[PDB]
């Protein structure tokens, strides 16, 4: 029915708010807790023949530590995205001066679009999420422990304490579902904190590779 698309759009949005907050962007509690009824009261009943059309529920958020560090989240009208869309969003990122965006791709992208994100990568960081990758916050799953991105000062103190080299840490691939959720990139480190049935708590470090 027309309501399943409204339920999807809300549930995807709620996950993105939690993701933005987990990245450290300033998200208001009223948007983190937003119910389907309040989402429907803001954006309308059905997106086909109605107000919550794609692009309309685009999101923009600013970082907690700096007001100029800002990130878009886009919900393309193209079910499979082309360069036609990405280059427009790059222009908007130039105009509004926004270095990051998330593209909530419905079904996929053309290979040239997938390449273009790397061809732009050091300039504008674009990251793709499939619609089905956001219907659940996988970090709320009981198997997924708490992941914390370390700062370079912490990573320097870590390696000085244990006298390690980065390659001696265990590793996480940048395509890992959680490393993407935290938006992490090569050479960063995650501090992972988990309950231990022998010790009570254990802290693990993964190098991103």
């Amino acid at each position: 029915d027309d309501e399943e698309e409204t339920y999807r759009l809300w549930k995807i949005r709620k996950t993105i708010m939690q993701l933005c907050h987990d990245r450290g962007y300033l998200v208001t509690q009223d948007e983190l807790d937003q119910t389907l009824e309040e989402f429907k009261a803001q954006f309308g009943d059905k997106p086909s023949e109605g107000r919550p059309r794609r692009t309309d529920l685009t999101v923009l958020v600013a970082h907690n530590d700096d007001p100029t560090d800002q990130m878009f989240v886009f919900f393309p009208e193209e079910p499979k995205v082309g360069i036609k869309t990405i280059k427009v969003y790059c222009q908007r990122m130039q105009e509004e001066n926004i270095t990051r965006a998330l593209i909530v791709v419905q079904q996929g992208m053309t290979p040239s679009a997938k390449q273009s994100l790397v061809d732009m990568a050091p300039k504008y960081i674009l990251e793709q999420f499939l619609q089905q990758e956001l219907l659940i916050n996988i970090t709320e799953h009981e198997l997924v422990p708490e992941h914390v991105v370390m700062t370079k000062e912490e990573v320097t103190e870590l390696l000085a304490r244990y006298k390690l080299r980065e390659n001696q840490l265990p590793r996480i691939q940048a395509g890992d579902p959680v490393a993407r959720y935290f938006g992490i990139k090569r050479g960063q480190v995650v501090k992972i904190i988990r309950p231990s049935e022998t010790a009570g708590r254990y802290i693990t470090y993964r190098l991103v590779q």
């Binding site: 339920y7 709320e140 799953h141 198997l143």
Partner: protein, 66 residues
Amino acid sequence: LSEKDVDPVRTTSNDIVEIFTVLGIEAVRKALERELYHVISFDGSYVNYRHLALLCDTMTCRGHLM
């Protein structure tokens, strides 16, 4: 996990490659220990955790299923 009224926190599979693709290397590190525990403990036997843990760490320290 996406469906309505399914519990997205607890619902889990015994297929570990699904867990790696949906939940990643740390969920695998836990789910693998659960699977190794289940085959050992089903017949009532017991093995110290530190052996289960060390195998699951060795099979996952690389960042992917070895």
